[PDB]
Amino acid sequence: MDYLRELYKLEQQAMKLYREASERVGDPVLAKILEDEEKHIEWLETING
C-alpha cells in the first residue's frame, strides 16, 4: 500500500513551494493554484476507498 502516499508526498511537497514562493514571485495565478491543489489533497484522502 503506497499509491496515495506517493501522491501526498508529491502534492503536499508542491503545495509547500507554491505557498512559499508567492510573496517573492508576485503573480496572482500562484494564489489560484493553492485553491486547485486544496481539492487535490481532499480527493487524495478520498482515494483510500
For a second copy, the binding residues in 1-49 under the rule CB under 8 A are 3-4, 6-7, 10-11, 13-14, 17-18, 21, 24-25, 27, 29-30, 33, 36-37, 39-40, 43, 46-47, 49
Site string for Zn ion, 3-32 (x = CB under 5 A): --------x---------------------
The span from the CA of 8 to the CA of 40, in Å, is 9
Beta strand spans in the chain (E) = none
Yes or no: say if 45 and 3 are a contact pair by the CB < 8 Å rule.
Answer: no
Cell output for 48: 483510500
CB of 43 to a second copy, least distance (A): 5
